[PDB]
Write a protein that binds this ligand. Structure first.
Ligand SMILES: C[C@H](CCC(=O)NCCC[N+](C)(C)CCCS(=O)(=O)[O-])[C@H]1CC[C@H]2[C@@H]3[C@H](O)C[C@@H]4C[C@H](O)CC[C@]4(C)[C@H]3C[C@H](O)[C@]12C
Ligand SMILES: C[C@H](CCC(=O)NCCC[N+](C)(C)CCCS(=O)(=O)[O-])[C@H]1CC[C@H]2[C@@H]3[C@H](O)C[C@@H]4C[C@H](O)CC[C@]4(C)[C@H]3C[C@H](O)[C@]12C
Ligand SMILES: CC(=O)[C@H]1CC[C@H]2[C@@H]3CCC4=CC(=O)CC[C@]4(C)[C@H]3CC[C@]12C
Ligand SMILES: CC(=O)[C@H]1CC[C@H]2[C@@H]3CCC4=CC(=O)CC[C@]4(C)[C@H]3CC[C@]12C
Lengths: 249, 250
């Protein structure tokens, strides 16, 4: 056979990115929120390299490629962050970058606190289910494919296929580790139910992101160049409500 | 909107068939089996009427239609039978027809007794699960679609899509109960798992049917005309192993 896409997912998985954060700084709301936005920009390049290499993706209309990234960029970063929080801190802390990690204090100072808790719960869920690296990588792919234009895509031809495979390949992963079907059947629930749960969270994250952005002047936080563009394009579409989450349940 | 798949399903559900059995007769292996085979013929005709009226069915290539039936005819009848046995006897007895119902003694004389038990366990599942009539109708539609030719279908064009609709429809039916996603997922698991259990049973039934078919002279068990051909046509394909059951997990 040809290489399993899972084996390719592993190959194209990005290496971790540093924030270039200065940890001697007092933890100040504005400074935290801004360095986070710096991090996002760096990660934004990473996730885009990734999606390109992501099998099936290039075969979508570039307006399709462009929209999917626009919607899901937040969820993918947040999801991946929760998986780092799990491997490194055991869901105890929010591990954004090896050099910027949110302890309790920082979550309170972020003025994102309730949103931080929410992200943390995603991480703890990872530790509760003991998600395997394979499960994670498949899930993260599906996340990309889990929010779509309310009016459907140009490549919907290609898309519905791709989405199916990554669902299939997710099954291939739940099946391999475990053995019994009663088990497979419930794994699949808990995992997909985890993916679904991401949507509500992202909404909240976005809500605040948008807010910080519009009020960036007043609040005095900085969104860097590349980051603005993406938000700028996304903000209107999602407020228009052209963005449809695809649930499992 | 346009009428529910499930509302059509209900419309086209066959009325119950009578066997025309003389219950004053003694309960004897040959008269019992022969009488079932008469019942199987009568049901056979309505099963086919049913499948035609089944939405998305006539859109399948006509070889696919004939194939699928030959495969699942046994499972449909036995599935339906266990449903009746749940509705009328509460899983207690085997209600093939209102006039011919197997109680313990008849399962003894049947000389299929371990199979009778098997079928009695299907109905008992219906009762353990408290299956709704809507759940039942969707499952029975799928049962048609759950054993396919191993080589594939001429138009798998349509089939795959149709099969999904009935799966969606089945979810539409579980959801109605107003449960949450986890209960729904659990209903779904336990239904399709009742479904899948059907093959094991049916395999066994086919076997003893094939047997009684061949040995009828020996056994003095008479297969009405129309029952004969379907078996004639099916038996080869089966023993060649060209029939692939479609499961919901191993
Ligand atoms: C009235 C409609 C419906 C609601 C739904 C979401 C709301 C927006 C978001 O909250 C993000 C952002 C926060 C700023 O602070 C103020 C501006 C802005 C654009 C809000 C404006 C307004 O209130 C919105 C449009
Ligand atoms: C006389 C009838 C009764 C049911 C039929 C048999 C069953 O089919 C099961 C079995 C499958 C094997 O592999 C090949 C042989 C065997 C014994 C069949 C051969 C033949 O048809 C049978 C014997
Ligand atoms: C400054 C601001 O509005 C906050 C709101 C939500 C925050 C983001 C939440 C998800 C997250 C995961 C990461 O790995 C770093 C960047 C991001 C993408 C965060 C960057 C800073 C954000 C953008
Ligand atoms: C004589 C014989 O081979 C028996 C073996 C199993 C029996 C069948 C079991 C399933 C059953 C359900 C019905 O409602 C009547 C017909 C049938 C289809 C039965 C017809 C007679 C059978 C076929």
């Amino acid at each position: 056979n040809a290489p399993s896409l899972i084996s390719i997912l592993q190959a194209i998985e990005p290496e971790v990115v540093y924030a270039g954060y200065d940890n001697t700084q007092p933890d100040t709301t504005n400074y935290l929120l801004s360095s986070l936005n710096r991090l996002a920009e760096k990660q934004l390049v990473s996730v885009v390299k990734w999606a390109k290499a992501l099998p099936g993706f290039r075969n979508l209309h570039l307006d399709d490629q462009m929209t999917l990234i626009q919607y899901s960029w937040m969820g993918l970063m947040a999801f991946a962050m929760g998986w780092r929080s799990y491997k490194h801190t055991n869901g105890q802390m929010l591990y954004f970058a090896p050099d910027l990690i949110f302890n309790e204090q920082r979550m309170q100072q972020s003025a994102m606190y309730d949103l931080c808790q929410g992200m943390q719960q995603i991480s703890q869920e990872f530790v509760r289910l003991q998600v395997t690296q394979e499960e994670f990588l498949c899930m993260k792919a599906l996340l990309l494919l889990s929010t779509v234009p309310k009016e459907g895509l140009k490549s919907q031809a290609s898309f519905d296929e791709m989405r199916m495979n990554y669902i299939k390949e997710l099954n291939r992963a739940i099946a391999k580790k475990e053995n019994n079907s009663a088990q497979n059947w419930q794994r699949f629930y808990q995992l997909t139910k985890l993916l679904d749960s991401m949507h509500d969270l992202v909404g909240g994250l976005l809500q605040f992101c948008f807010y910080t952005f519009v009020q960036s002047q007043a609040l005095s936080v900085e969104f860097p160049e590349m980051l603005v563009e993406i938000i700028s394009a996304q903000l209107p579409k999602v407020l228009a409500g052209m963005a449809k989450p695809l649930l499992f349940h």
